[PDB]
Structures are given as C-alpha cells and as structure tokens.
Amino acid sequence: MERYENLFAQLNDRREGAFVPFVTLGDPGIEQSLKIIDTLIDAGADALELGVPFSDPLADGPTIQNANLRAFAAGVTPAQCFEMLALIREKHPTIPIGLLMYANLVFNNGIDAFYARCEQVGVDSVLVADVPVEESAPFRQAALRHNIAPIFICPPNADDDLLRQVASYGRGYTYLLSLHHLIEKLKEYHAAPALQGFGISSPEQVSAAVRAGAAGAISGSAIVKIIEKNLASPKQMLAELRSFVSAMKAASRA
Amino acid sequence: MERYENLFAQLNDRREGAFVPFVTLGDPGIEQSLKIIDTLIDAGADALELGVPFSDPLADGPTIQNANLRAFAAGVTPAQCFEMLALIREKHPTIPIGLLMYANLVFNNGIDAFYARCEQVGVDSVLVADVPVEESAPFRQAALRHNIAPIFICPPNADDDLLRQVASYGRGYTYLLSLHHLIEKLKEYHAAPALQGFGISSPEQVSAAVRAGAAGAISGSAIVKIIEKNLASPKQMLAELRSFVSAMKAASRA
Amino acid sequence: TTLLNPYFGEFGGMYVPQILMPALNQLEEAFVSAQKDPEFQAQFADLLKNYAGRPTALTKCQNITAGTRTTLYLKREDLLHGGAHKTNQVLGQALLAKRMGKSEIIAETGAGQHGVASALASALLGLKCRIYMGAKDVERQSPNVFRMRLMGAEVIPVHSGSATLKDACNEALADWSGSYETAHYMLGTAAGPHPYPTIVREFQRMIGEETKAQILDKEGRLPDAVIACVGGGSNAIGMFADFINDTSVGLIGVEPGGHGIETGEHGAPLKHGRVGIYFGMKAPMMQTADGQIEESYSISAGLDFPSVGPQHAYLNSIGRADYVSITDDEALEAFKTLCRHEGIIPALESSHALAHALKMMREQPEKEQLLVVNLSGRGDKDIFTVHDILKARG
Amino acid sequence: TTLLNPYFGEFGGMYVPQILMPALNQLEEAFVSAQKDPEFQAQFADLLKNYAGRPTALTKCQNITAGTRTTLYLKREDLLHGGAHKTNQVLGQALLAKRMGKSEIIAETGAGQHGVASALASALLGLKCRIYMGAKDVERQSPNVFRMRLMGAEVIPVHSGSATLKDACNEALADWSGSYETAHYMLGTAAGPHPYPTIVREFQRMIGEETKAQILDKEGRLPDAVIACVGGGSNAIGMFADFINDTSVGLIGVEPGGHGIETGEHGAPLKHGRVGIYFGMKAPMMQTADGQIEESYSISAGLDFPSVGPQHAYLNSIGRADYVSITDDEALEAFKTLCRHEGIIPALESSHALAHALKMMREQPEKEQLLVVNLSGRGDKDIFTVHDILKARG
Ligand SMILES: O=P(O)(O)OC[C@@H](O)[C@@H](O)c1c[nH]c2ccccc12
Ligand SMILES: O=P(O)(O)OC[C@@H](O)[C@@H](O)c1c[nH]c2ccccc12
Ligand SMILES: *Cc1c(COP(=O)(O)O)cnc(C)c1O
Ligand SMILES: *Cc1c(COP(=O)(O)O)cnc(C)c1O
C-alpha cells in the first residue's frame, strides 16, 4: 500500500496522472517477459499490472487469452511467476506492482498463504478478477494482514451501494472500468485513487481520463498486441513497446 | 382336362406312374428354354409344369427364385411365355401342359381373359400358387369355362374339410405337397389323381410315391439345378437333363 | 371360413399359399379371443403406459399457424418409446404370439425400422426374434442393424434372389410355413393377408381414441380433419379408426409423391396405381402394364412401399376418406418449418402429413379450420439425409 | 445481498466479475417472483405436459433383476422430448427470460446436447438463440450443430484461446456482460454461480416428485435408494430433491470413473478432486497441484466435466447422499444389458447409474431392495461410439 500512496502523492505534486501497463508474466517466455517489463519501466510506466497465467480465465479478452496461451507454451507456472516477481522488485524498489489474479490460484494453497507470498516477493496489490465485493471478505482481510492493497473493480453498472463498498474496502487504487459521476462519488466516499481501464490504447484517452478526474489509466490489450505482432523480432518488440509507453506516459503529464 | 384324363388312363393301363418336371419358361433364354423343354419330353417327361417369371414370387424356393432372375435377365415377359407355350403345343399334341402362376399375372388383364389365352395356346391346367381354396372361386370358374383344369395344392397340414374341397374343386391332378392317409382320403373323395411334389430329386422317391398310391411325382429344383450348373455349356446341360429325366421316368414304370 | 370378414369392399382377402391358411386362421382366432379378454387388454394397456409412454401428448402449434385461421395440433407419436408409432402394435402382436404359446418371432425389414420395433418388443417379452433382411439392405442400414443385434435379435442377411426386401419376405414366410406352431410372423403395417390389416388397426387405434379425448378436452369439439402419412397404412388407420363414424371429421391420407407423380418415381399406388394381388391381398399397387410389381420411390424409406392397406382403398372408394400426395421437396420444407418454428424434428414420413396441413392452411389462410396431424415419428434418423440434400443444393 | 442463500454449507457462492452481479441478482429476483406466480407455474406445467410429454413413465424392469431380490424401476427421462432430462429446465429458464422482458438466449456447448436443448426451447418460445461453441467442438459434433441450426439457433464457432469449451464459455459470458438487459444466459447444469444451482434444481425437481407418486402408487412405499449419474448434477438433483427429507431413502450419485480412478483419466471430482473456485462457484474440482483446472475424461461426453454442482458437494459432506464412480467398461456393460433384456437403449451417461444399480444387485443378490435409476436420456446418439469400441475389441 505504501508504494501506491507514495506514487500518487508524488504524481499529484506534479499534477500528473499515472500510466500503468498490463502484461502477462512469462509471455512470451520468462527471459523475454523480464526484458519487456524492464522496457515498460524504462519507458515511463508509473506502476505495473501483471497477470499470472491461469487455465480458465473467463474475464480475459482475446488478446490477453492469447498471452496466457503463449506463457503456457513456454511452461510458465505460478511458482515461476513469483520468482520473476521477486527479481523485478529486486531491480526496482519503488514502482508499485499489482497482480491480476483468478480466485483459484489465490485459494489453491490457502488464501492467507497467497498474500503472505505476495508480501515476501514485494507485490503491492492484488485484484482477483472473479471475486465480486460480495465474496471478497477472506481475500481483503488476508490482503490487509500482509500489507497488500485489495483492488476492486468499479463497473459501469455500479450503484450507490457498490460505490460505498468499493470506497470502504479497497486500497491502493480503484479499478474504474470504462465517467465523471462515478469518479466524483468515489472521491466523495474517499475511495482509493481511480485508474481507468478497458480499451485505453491512445494518448488522447490517457489525457481524457486525467481531465475527467481519474488519477491515471491502465492499458493492457494495446501493450499485449505489440508483443503478439513482434514475436519473430524481439528487438523490434522492445523498441515498439518503448515508443508506445513513452507516448502514453507523456499524455499524463501536466 | 382331356389331355390329363387320357394320360392317366394310359399310364394306369401300363401300371405306370407319371414323371413331371418343372422348369421356368425362358430360363436361361427363350431359345435355350425351348431346347430344354424338347429334351425333357424326348427323355420321357409325361407332362410339364411351367412357371411364368413374376417379380414377387413369394412361394418359390431359392433354386426357382434364381431361375426367375435368369429369365428376367433375358428379358422374358408373360407375352413371350404364351408365344413359347403355343409353339410347344404346336410341336407336342398330347403332352399335358400345366402352368404355375402367381395371382397378379392371372388377375392383371382379367381372370377370364387369362384362362381364355391359356385355352387358345393349348395349356391344360393352371396352379395359382398364392390362391388358397378359400379364394379360388373366380379362378376355378374361369378355368372350367375354358376347359382348363384348376389345380389345388394339398398340403401336409390339410384337414378333412380341405381334402373334401380339393377333391371337389380340382381337376387334372391334385398337387400333393410332400402320404398314405392323404392319398387314401383323396381317392375316397374322388379327387383328381395325385402328383407328389417337393424335394423329389432321385429315382427311389419316384418309385416310393407310386408305391404309396400317388399317380406320379413332380420334380422342379433338381431339374433347375442342372440348368444352373451348366450355364456355360448348353450342350452338356441338355445331355445331363436327358440323363436325369430318363432315370426318373424309368423309376415310374411297372 | 373365418370369424371376421377378410375384405373391405373389394379389397383385402387371404391370397397366400394353402400351407399358410392354418397359421392365419389360428392368428385370427387368437386375436378374437384376446379382444374379449380383460386380462389381455390390461396387460397390453400396462405395457403401453408404463413401458412405451402412452398416452402421447397432443401439441398445439401456434407459431406455425400465426397469421392464419388454422389451429393445428400434432399427435405426438414421436414421443413414444422407439420414436415412432410402430411400437404400439408390435407390443400387441408379441402378446398375441405368447397367447398362442409361441416363444419366437419372425420378421423381415428393408429400411430397418420395423426390425428395430420387432426386436425391442421381443427383448421385453422374452421372445427369440429372427429378422430376415436383404443383404443389400443390411449393407446400407448399419445403424438399424446394430440396434437390432444390441436388442438380441438375429439379423439374417438374405442373398437369395435379388438380395432385397421381397427376398427377405419370401424367406420369412417360407420359415413361417414350417415353424408357425412355435413362431409368429410379426407383419409391420396394416396390409398383407387377413387378419393382419384388422389386427394392426385395432392395435394402433389408441392413437385416434386418445386424439379424440384430447381434442374434446382442449377445444370442446372434434377436428375438421385428421391427417396422416400413408406407406402401408398403419399410423393413418390408427388415427382414423375412432373417427370413422364421426362423419363431420375429414380423414386425409398422404402418400409420397417422390420426384412428382408425372415422373413415375413415387410411392402413391392408392391414387396412381391399379388394383392387383400381391403380398397376400387384393389392393391398389404400382405395376407394369403386364402385371409385374413396380419399384416405388420416396425420399423417406418408411413410405417407399408399392402398395397400401385394403381398408384405405375401401375408405377411398366410398368417399369416406380422401387421399393426396406430397413430393420430396414439399416434405423437406415441412421438416425445416417444424424444426425452426416449434423445435420438433419430425420424421420425413410424418413430414408428408405436415406438408399437406401446411398447404391446406397456406392455400386458404382465412378459412377457419381445426386440424390434427399424426406426427408418426421423430426425425433424428433423417438429419444426414436432409443435411446431404441441402448441402448438395448449396 | 441476495434473497436466497447462495451457499450449500461451504459450497456455491457467486464468484463472478463484479459486472455480472446485477444480472445474477436480476435473475434471482425474477425466479423468486416466478415461483410464487400461479400463472408462471401453469404456463411451465402446460409446456411440460403438452409439449415435452410429462409425466414420464416409471418402468419396472423384471427381466434384468430375475433371480435376485432387487426390484428395479427406471424413471423414463429418455422418453422426454429431445431424448434427455435437459429439456425440462431449459423450458423453465426460457420462461424466466421472457418474464424479465428478454427476447434473446445465450448458451455455450461442448458436446452439443445443452446446445440442442437451448435451441429447441428458444424455437418454441420465440427467442433468438446464439450458442457459442469451440471450433474444435464444432468440427466433431456435426449432427448436433446441424440440429441446432435447423431449429434456428446461431452457432458461433469460437477460435479464440484454445478453441474449446472454456473459450466458448468466456465469450458467452463476455457477451452476457454487455447484453444482459436483453439476453439471458441459459446455464445447462446445476452448477455455476447462484442462483443457477437453485434454479436448475427447482426446474428439474418434477423428476423426483413424479417418481415419488409413481412408486407409492405401484409399490405402496418409497424406494430403498434412488440412483443417478452426475456430470454437473442436474438430473441427479432433480431426482433427489423431493426425497431429501425422506431419510429412509438412499440418494446415490454416480460420477464417471473413465479408464479407472487410479489412471487420472476420469470425471469424478466430488470424490477424487479437491475444493477450488471456478465457473462462478466454490466446489470440488479436478486440479493440478498448483491450481490449474485439469482435463476430465469419460467415454460419455455428457459426463466429461471437471467439477460438480455445490448442492451435491454439500449433501455428500453431511452424509445425506453417497457418491460412487463407474468406469467406461462398467457403463458399456450396463448399456448392452439394458438393450438386450429390456429393449431400451440408454444414454451412456445414464448407463453409469444403471451400472451401479446392477452392481448393488449382483454383489448381494439375496438382499431385498427397491431401487429407482434415473434413466436421464436415450442412447441412439451413442450407437456409433459403442459400435466402434466393440468392433475394435473384436
Ligand atoms: O486489455 P485492456 O482493454 O487495455 O484492459 C486491461 C485489462 O485487460 C487488464 O487490466 C486485465 C487483464 N485481465 C483482466 C481481468 C479482469 C479485469 C481486468 C483485466
Ligand atoms: O422344386 P421342388 O422341390 O422339386 O418342388 C417343385 C416346385 O418348385 C414347383 O412345382 C413349383 C415352383 N413354384 C411353386 C410355387 C408353389 C408350389 C409349387 C411350385
Ligand atoms: C414406418 C413409418 C411410417 C409408415 O408406415 P405406416 O404403416 O403407413 O404407418 C410412417 N411414419 C413413421 C415415423 C414410420 O416409422
Ligand atoms: C447432459 C446429460 C447428463 C449430465 O448432466 P447432469 O447435469 O449431471 O444431469 C446426464 N445424462 C444425460 C442423458 C444427459 O444428456
């Protein structure tokens, strides 16, 4: 939680929004995924959102579904992902790292033990994609015991009760699914800072999100497509990723 | 009817039984069927039993079923059969000729007109295989109007009422399906002379039939097998038929 | 001498070789005895209800008649065990075989549907069933051959003659002529020699009896017409029998018109053939000019038969029932229509009956009429046939 | 907040992304409203009876139990329209969709059986049905694909991800997350997130209600045990529900043991898997040691599912129901046994339930016991599968 508080305080001192890419750990192989992640950071990512490949990821869109399949073809497992996460934190001490998880990989060997391993490797937040606020009690409790922010999605079909729960229970950032009314109510309820996500693939959508009052934006399919289109030229993949991330990040600056 | 009365009177003066082969008209072609028939007669047939190929001959055994199929492959029709029958009668004035028919070929253009055509070509009797005595009224009436003997089958499951009807209605000969009790009752009821048929394929069965009190025996599958086995050597077919018919006929003599 | 009249007007009779007359008389006497036996009646009712699933529904199809003044119900024989009406009468005939002290059933089948029906009743009632089948039909009806053998029947491939259905029949009757003391010949339609047309009607007449009670319950009156497909005539006589004396109720029988009556490639002897004698009966049949039985044709194998039961020929002659024909393409359209609008996949045989009700409705959409179609069977068995035709036309 | 409890003990819940919660709550409220509405109840009863053919028979099978003290009845869901119990609840869910003002149905299918069920109900009730199907399943289930399209459903081949069932599901739920105002997601078993396990049970519970009335009529007492196969759990919960409070009645659920539990190639998570969270629910599932969902296996595609409904897991936990497994070869033997001795061709899914009743009888042939097996479907669809296995073994 501390890393997100530190980053949003610093960005607000600079009147800047955050730019947060999403990638699947291990896509398209462990080594290339570590180089992709260091490029995203070197190009200006403020924080990272990282998926652990799961066999039945019913909320992933097709671009992401194909990222999971490449990672599984390279033999990536959750254990390997945690090893990658430890090395990423060992290289970058302050960037907030959040995971995007499916409930079975968290529940599998004990919900408390999953959040203990996240704390041990240096993860700062976890979003469990198939746990709604109604079922989140054991996940959010374990997260807070291990100083991990529990992230909640605030959908476009949210009602007032949902807004209040998301404000009260979430920490780190509020995942705002692509918004002025939702944004204003979240701030009224003192929710964690909002990051707009879904469909963010150009500079003008980053600036629009910050102008709407969000603290930043998340982009995943646009980033994953660059991987998918350059599998045969890893050098070109990294150069294209650097170009895309520095343009998106420049859109967030005052 | 006259030809059968004349033949059974003559055979009884000689204390002889009749030997009657069956063949399908047109098997295996018209010309070869005419030569087969003249060989059967030259070898000692007393009378003939001749089938007209029909498409659905539900009482024919497999040997006969295959004789129909050869005749149909040679394009034989009922009209062609009647042409053959006229020429057979034109060559042999006294031998009794009986047909073995299925009811549709008799009913087809008028039951009376069928028995008129039989009379015109010189046929002496007709056995309609799928007409039991219970349905025979129109067939037997038309037959008697055209001086044709109506032939009835006396089966092994006959009862006393059946015997009396067969005795009363039949003329020419009684077809006895392979028998002392049936034979004695038929004579008691003044039935037409009995010819045993079904399975007769050797000399000793001809003599046994005559010893049992029958006036003779009919043989069809044994004759038709000789045709079927010699299709590729028509000369040999006729020589084998002559040998078989003269042995069967010799068994009937006193 | 018989107990019952073997003829319907000019049609019917017992045109078999003399050696089969005792088997027919034995059967007729067993049937007349059974029909007066409350226990036989209770046993048959029990199997019909608790084994085969009677009564069958009577389904109103509102989607298909929308925008017209036709109300259409379908008698659901497609929901009977085995998927067709054939099951009703093979249970009845199996019980008659047992009443005569017989433990064996003889049957012949071309398409394989009557074979399956005979094998399932024989499995249920402890009867040894042997089913004669032309080697050519064996080759082409693998699925049905396998169902029969799964149910314990002996499927005997016939190679004699032309190795087709008429040859399976000859062999089946030859066997029956030697074994009728211990074996019963289970004929699969309302045709052949007496007493079969009568027995098959009486053991299918619950289709029309139920339909009468069900339509009176739901509409408070009888149908303007009841409509059924006609191969040999068993499902149609089953639907019509109980309405014969209700003179306001039309009785419409539908024969297959195949590629079109004018082509000669059809199965419609009642209206387009000529009386003849074959298969033990005097009836309309498809024949050559010199009396040979012609080959029939229909897209539906179950209706591909060159003759018709004698009671149908009689009812037509006197004007009590009317007979029409439906072509392959009209049957295929009715099949698609029912699948799309009611979620019911009908047998292609039954689709001929449905096609004629659809024509009655569409030709005169403002005539008020209450029609019942006998949906004689389900059409899962016809999906490849339909699929390959439609694929071929693109 | 829900109206009904979403859990059965520890099992069940609503483990979906937040954006699908309003659709689930809407559905639950519609269902609770419907269950108190006499008109909804009358409409559902009407379709069940006059369209689908309920009640189904309860058939005593004396031939199969001869020489033993077991009396065995089969609940005949194989005679329901479509040939399986699946029809009952898809009619109920189609009516719920219409009550919510929806004119579209969304479904996903692997084997194609739930797809056909959803397409037939949608055809009958005027609903536009789109069925997502992994391109690999499309390729292998041609017959079922063709039935669905004949009935007007749009079959959408899914190539994304691995082009299998889990990918059809993801796409189906993604669609549903955007279109739930006008479309209803028709789940095909008693699993997934609340309120589906509850709704599917209540819309299949006429199987056990009828069975109770029918067995009391015929034997004057309740069964010693009712036995049913268990894929996701809808036909078994349908049979068991009405007997839950009759504590003398055993409830036996049969999962597929495939090539043998010890091989790992089976579909028996309730007894041999481990609790996890997937498909919107907390339930027993087949998983790797690091939590990936494992692949299931059964000779029967309908039972090839790696999890089980939460009410089953609950009933097992408390000891009210008992769960066993039956291998491919035991299911194949029960399939052959029923065909030969009763003339009924059972679905291979249902053959697992029958195989376990046959083992209860044969292991202890002098124990007096009254057993009911739910014959969930007919097996005409399985004849090629059975044929090619047996041909392969010679
Ligand atoms: O790909 P997009 O449209 O840029 O949105 C990011 C989204 O994919 C990433 O945040 C994500 C991956 N899987 C998820 C599951 C649920 C919610 C969000 C996600
Ligand atoms: O062939 P066999 O067993 O020798 O019996 C003569 C019989 O075939 C011939 O008389 C016949 C041919 N077709 C028939 C039909 C019915 C009665 C008799 C027949
Ligand atoms: C066999 C069959 C028929 C044809 O026979 P009928 O004796 O004329 O009824 C019709 N419909 C179905 C579904 C059949 O199986
Ligand atoms: C689909 C099916 C099943 C399995 O599903 P449940 O939800 O467990 O009932 C079982 N039997 C038949 C015949 C089926 O079609």
Tab-separated table of N, CA and C in Angstrom, chain C residues 67-151:
chain	number	residue	atom	x	y	z
C	67	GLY	N	-51.003	-15.854	-38.076
C	67	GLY	CA	-51.443	-15.066	-39.253
C	67	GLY	C	-52.500	-15.810	-40.065
C	68	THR	N	-52.975	-16.971	-39.675
C	68	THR	CA	-53.980	-17.714	-40.418
C	68	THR	C	-55.114	-18.071	-39.474
C	69	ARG	N	-56.191	-18.638	-40.001
C	69	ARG	CA	-57.307	-19.099	-39.207
C	69	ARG	C	-57.277	-20.626	-38.981
C	70	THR	N	-56.131	-21.231	-39.226
C	70	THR	CA	-55.942	-22.655	-38.957
C	70	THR	C	-55.417	-22.828	-37.525
C	71	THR	N	-55.990	-23.783	-36.810
C	71	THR	CA	-55.413	-24.161	-35.473
C	71	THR	C	-54.907	-25.590	-35.735
C	72	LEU	N	-53.683	-25.827	-35.418
C	72	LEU	CA	-53.076	-27.106	-35.744
C	72	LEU	C	-52.530	-27.790	-34.450
C	73	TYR	N	-52.912	-29.023	-34.285
C	73	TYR	CA	-52.321	-29.844	-33.191
C	73	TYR	C	-51.520	-30.983	-33.826
C	74	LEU	N	-50.477	-31.472	-33.099
C	74	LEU	CA	-49.749	-32.628	-33.595
C	74	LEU	C	-49.887	-33.787	-32.537
C	75	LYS	N	-50.336	-34.923	-33.033
C	75	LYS	CA	-50.423	-36.098	-32.111
C	75	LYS	C	-49.004	-36.607	-32.005
C	76	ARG	N	-48.444	-36.674	-30.797
C	76	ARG	CA	-47.016	-36.869	-30.613
C	76	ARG	C	-46.591	-38.311	-30.550
C	77	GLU	N	-46.725	-39.041	-31.667
C	77	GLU	CA	-46.221	-40.436	-31.651
C	77	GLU	C	-44.711	-40.495	-31.711
C	78	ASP	N	-44.069	-39.363	-32.060
C	78	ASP	CA	-42.626	-39.190	-31.989
C	78	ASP	C	-42.106	-39.281	-30.552
C	79	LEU	N	-42.940	-39.141	-29.520
C	79	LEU	CA	-42.503	-39.279	-28.142
C	79	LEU	C	-42.706	-40.694	-27.606
C	80	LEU	N	-43.278	-41.595	-28.414
C	80	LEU	CA	-43.409	-42.976	-27.991
C	80	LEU	C	-42.043	-43.633	-27.936
C	81	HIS	N	-41.918	-44.613	-27.044
C	81	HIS	CA	-40.649	-45.353	-26.980
C	81	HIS	C	-40.297	-45.952	-28.340
C	82	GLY	N	-39.089	-45.735	-28.812
C	82	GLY	CA	-38.557	-46.148	-30.104
C	82	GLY	C	-38.631	-44.990	-31.106
C	83	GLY	N	-39.375	-43.922	-30.774
C	83	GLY	CA	-39.515	-42.746	-31.620
C	83	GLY	C	-40.535	-42.836	-32.755
C	84	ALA	N	-41.397	-43.866	-32.813
C	84	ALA	CA	-42.411	-43.922	-33.888
C	84	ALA	C	-43.601	-44.714	-33.375
C	85	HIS	N	-44.744	-44.589	-34.020
C	85	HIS	CA	-45.948	-45.324	-33.667
C	85	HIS	C	-45.852	-46.829	-33.798
C	86	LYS	N	-44.887	-47.380	-34.553
C	86	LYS	CA	-44.696	-48.786	-34.809
C	86	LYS	C	-44.665	-49.618	-33.529
C	87	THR	N	-44.224	-49.014	-32.439
C	87	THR	CA	-44.089	-49.732	-31.154
C	87	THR	C	-45.417	-50.226	-30.643
C	88	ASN	N	-46.484	-49.410	-30.870
C	88	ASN	CA	-47.767	-49.819	-30.277
C	88	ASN	C	-48.168	-51.228	-30.686
C	89	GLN	N	-48.184	-51.466	-32.004
C	89	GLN	CA	-48.753	-52.753	-32.485
C	89	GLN	C	-47.812	-53.942	-32.360
C	90	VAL	N	-46.497	-53.724	-32.376
C	90	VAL	CA	-45.567	-54.851	-32.152
C	90	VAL	C	-45.680	-55.324	-30.709
C	91	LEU	N	-46.079	-54.486	-29.731
C	91	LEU	CA	-46.249	-54.978	-28.368
C	91	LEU	C	-47.469	-55.887	-28.382
C	92	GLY	N	-48.577	-55.449	-28.992
C	92	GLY	CA	-49.822	-56.186	-29.139
C	92	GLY	C	-49.593	-57.507	-29.844
C	93	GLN	N	-48.881	-57.514	-30.967
C	93	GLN	CA	-48.636	-58.785	-31.662
C	93	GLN	C	-47.716	-59.706	-30.861
C	94	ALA	N	-46.753	-59.196	-30.096
C	94	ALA	CA	-45.890	-60.037	-29.250
C	94	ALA	C	-46.746	-60.710	-28.202
C	95	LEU	N	-47.716	-59.980	-27.619
C	95	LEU	CA	-48.615	-60.578	-26.634
C	95	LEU	C	-49.460	-61.658	-27.281
C	96	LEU	N	-49.939	-61.469	-28.522
C	96	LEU	CA	-50.718	-62.486	-29.214
C	96	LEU	C	-49.859	-63.732	-29.425
C	97	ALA	N	-48.582	-63.572	-29.839
C	97	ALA	CA	-47.687	-64.719	-30.029
C	97	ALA	C	-47.603	-65.548	-28.728
C	98	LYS	N	-47.457	-64.840	-27.606
C	98	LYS	CA	-47.371	-65.528	-26.297
C	98	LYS	C	-48.691	-66.207	-25.939
C	99	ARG	N	-49.811	-65.594	-26.293
C	99	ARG	CA	-51.128	-66.216	-26.053
C	99	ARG	C	-51.284	-67.505	-26.816
C	100	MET	N	-50.660	-67.643	-27.997
C	100	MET	CA	-50.712	-68.823	-28.831
C	100	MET	C	-49.653	-69.847	-28.411
C	101	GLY	N	-48.956	-69.529	-27.308
C	101	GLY	CA	-47.915	-70.411	-26.781
C	101	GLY	C	-46.604	-70.362	-27.565
C	102	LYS	N	-46.306	-69.302	-28.304
C	102	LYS	CA	-45.117	-69.180	-29.125
C	102	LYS	C	-44.009	-68.402	-28.422
C	103	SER	N	-42.749	-68.769	-28.653
C	103	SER	CA	-41.646	-68.107	-27.973
C	103	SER	C	-40.701	-67.500	-29.015
C	104	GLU	N	-41.083	-67.508	-30.280
C	104	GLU	CA	-40.232	-67.000	-31.352
C	104	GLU	C	-40.974	-65.998	-32.276
C	105	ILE	N	-40.224	-65.012	-32.740
C	105	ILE	CA	-40.878	-64.015	-33.640
C	105	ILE	C	-40.028	-64.031	-34.890
C	106	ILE	N	-40.727	-63.968	-36.008
C	106	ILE	CA	-40.175	-63.855	-37.318
C	106	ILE	C	-40.569	-62.485	-37.887
C	107	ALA	N	-39.602	-61.799	-38.498
C	107	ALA	CA	-39.902	-60.525	-39.134
C	107	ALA	C	-38.940	-60.318	-40.312
C	108	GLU	N	-39.274	-59.403	-41.183
C	108	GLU	CA	-38.430	-59.015	-42.314
C	108	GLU	C	-38.437	-57.482	-42.297
C	109	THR	N	-37.357	-56.866	-42.790
C	109	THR	CA	-37.301	-55.401	-42.741
C	109	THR	C	-36.417	-54.898	-43.893
C	110	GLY	N	-36.751	-53.771	-44.457
C	110	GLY	CA	-35.893	-53.231	-45.556
C	110	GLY	C	-35.049	-52.094	-44.986
C	111	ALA	N	-35.735	-51.028	-44.638
C	111	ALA	CA	-35.261	-49.810	-44.020
C	111	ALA	C	-34.725	-50.020	-42.610
C	112	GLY	N	-35.248	-51.063	-41.943
C	112	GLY	CA	-34.757	-51.395	-40.612
C	112	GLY	C	-35.610	-50.891	-39.468
C	113	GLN	N	-36.615	-50.082	-39.702
C	113	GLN	CA	-37.454	-49.536	-38.655
C	113	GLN	C	-38.419	-50.573	-38.045
C	114	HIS	N	-39.050	-51.367	-38.909
C	114	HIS	CA	-39.943	-52.415	-38.365
C	114	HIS	C	-39.042	-53.447	-37.666
C	115	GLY	N	-37.833	-53.675	-38.201
C	115	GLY	CA	-36.946	-54.654	-37.493
C	115	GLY	C	-36.644	-54.242	-36.054
C	116	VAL	N	-36.262	-52.978	-35.847
C	116	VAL	CA	-35.975	-52.441	-34.515
C	116	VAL	C	-37.214	-52.562	-33.628
C	117	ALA	N	-38.372	-52.193	-34.177
C	117	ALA	CA	-39.615	-52.299	-33.388
C	117	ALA	C	-39.823	-53.746	-32.973
C	118	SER	N	-39.741	-54.693	-33.896
C	118	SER	CA	-39.948	-56.101	-33.551
C	118	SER	C	-38.903	-56.557	-32.552
C	119	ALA	N	-37.635	-56.140	-32.687
C	119	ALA	CA	-36.588	-56.607	-31.752
C	119	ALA	C	-36.818	-56.022	-30.378
C	120	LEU	N	-37.245	-54.739	-30.290
C	120	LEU	CA	-37.447	-54.246	-28.896
C	120	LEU	C	-38.611	-54.935	-28.209
C	121	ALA	N	-39.725	-55.210	-28.876
C	121	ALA	CA	-40.832	-55.877	-28.185
C	121	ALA	C	-40.404	-57.305	-27.780
C	122	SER	N	-39.666	-57.965	-28.704
C	122	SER	CA	-39.257	-59.345	-28.406
C	122	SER	C	-38.290	-59.364	-27.210
C	123	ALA	N	-37.390	-58.359	-27.117
C	123	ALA	CA	-36.476	-58.319	-25.955
C	123	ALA	C	-37.262	-58.178	-24.655
C	124	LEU	N	-38.220	-57.243	-24.654
C	124	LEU	CA	-39.036	-57.035	-23.473
C	124	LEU	C	-39.834	-58.260	-23.037
C	125	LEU	N	-40.422	-58.957	-23.997
C	125	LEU	CA	-41.349	-60.072	-23.666
C	125	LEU	C	-40.756	-61.462	-23.695
C	126	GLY	N	-39.449	-61.592	-23.780
C	126	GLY	CA	-38.742	-62.870	-23.705
C	126	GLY	C	-38.850	-63.733	-24.931
C	127	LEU	N	-39.020	-63.155	-26.107
C	127	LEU	CA	-39.127	-63.826	-27.359
C	127	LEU	C	-37.852	-63.836	-28.183
C	128	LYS	N	-37.565	-64.990	-28.789
C	128	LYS	CA	-36.388	-65.075	-29.681
C	128	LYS	C	-36.783	-64.511	-31.042
C	129	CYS	N	-36.122	-63.456	-31.475
C	129	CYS	CA	-36.521	-62.801	-32.709
C	129	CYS	C	-35.471	-62.952	-33.797
C	130	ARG	N	-35.936	-63.383	-34.964
C	130	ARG	CA	-35.024	-63.535	-36.104
C	130	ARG	C	-35.637	-62.634	-37.159
C	131	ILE	N	-34.839	-61.804	-37.766
C	131	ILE	CA	-35.293	-60.774	-38.697
C	131	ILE	C	-34.521	-60.991	-40.020
C	132	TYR	N	-35.281	-61.311	-41.070
C	132	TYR	CA	-34.691	-61.535	-42.395
C	132	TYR	C	-34.441	-60.186	-43.071
C	133	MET	N	-33.277	-60.018	-43.735
C	133	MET	CA	-33.014	-58.687	-44.314
C	133	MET	C	-32.159	-58.833	-45.579
C	134	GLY	N	-32.631	-58.252	-46.654
C	134	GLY	CA	-31.857	-58.438	-47.938
C	134	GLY	C	-30.421	-57.966	-47.714
C	135	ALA	N	-29.418	-58.703	-48.203
C	135	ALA	CA	-28.012	-58.344	-47.962
C	135	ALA	C	-27.714	-56.919	-48.373
C	136	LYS	N	-28.383	-56.405	-49.404
C	136	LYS	CA	-28.221	-55.018	-49.840
C	136	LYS	C	-28.758	-54.062	-48.792
C	137	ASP	N	-29.832	-54.424	-48.095
C	137	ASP	CA	-30.368	-53.530	-47.040
C	137	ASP	C	-29.467	-53.612	-45.830
C	138	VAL	N	-28.918	-54.805	-45.575
C	138	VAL	CA	-28.016	-54.987	-44.426
C	138	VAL	C	-26.872	-53.988	-44.547
C	139	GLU	N	-26.241	-53.969	-45.714
C	139	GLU	CA	-25.154	-53.100	-46.091
C	139	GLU	C	-25.410	-51.612	-45.898
C	140	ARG	N	-26.597	-51.134	-46.243
C	140	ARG	CA	-26.977	-49.743	-46.152
C	140	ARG	C	-27.672	-49.285	-44.873
C	141	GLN	N	-27.924	-50.181	-43.895
C	141	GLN	CA	-28.730	-49.733	-42.745
C	141	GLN	C	-28.063	-50.219	-41.458
C	142	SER	N	-26.741	-49.986	-41.509
C	142	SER	CA	-25.861	-50.350	-40.412
C	142	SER	C	-26.379	-49.931	-39.035
C	143	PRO	N	-26.793	-48.714	-38.841
C	143	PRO	CA	-27.286	-48.250	-37.539
C	143	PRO	C	-28.447	-49.115	-37.046
C	144	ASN	N	-29.449	-49.310	-37.887
C	144	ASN	CA	-30.599	-50.130	-37.507
C	144	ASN	C	-30.205	-51.585	-37.322
C	145	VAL	N	-29.293	-52.149	-38.121
C	145	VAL	CA	-28.815	-53.486	-37.947
C	145	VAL	C	-28.176	-53.613	-36.561
C	146	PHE	N	-27.323	-52.654	-36.202
C	146	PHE	CA	-26.702	-52.661	-34.891
C	146	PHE	C	-27.727	-52.495	-33.770
C	147	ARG	N	-28.742	-51.623	-33.876
C	147	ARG	CA	-29.764	-51.593	-32.818
C	147	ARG	C	-30.424	-52.977	-32.672
C	148	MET	N	-30.803	-53.586	-33.810
C	148	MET	CA	-31.485	-54.905	-33.652
C	148	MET	C	-30.607	-55.898	-32.929
C	149	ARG	N	-29.324	-56.031	-33.298
C	149	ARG	CA	-28.457	-57.020	-32.649
C	149	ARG	C	-28.155	-56.659	-31.196
C	150	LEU	N	-28.039	-55.369	-30.850
C	150	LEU	CA	-27.920	-54.984	-29.456
C	150	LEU	C	-29.091	-55.513	-28.652
C	151	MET	N	-30.301	-55.451	-29.224
C	151	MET	CA	-31.502	-55.957	-28.550
C	151	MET	C	-31.691	-57.463	-28.646
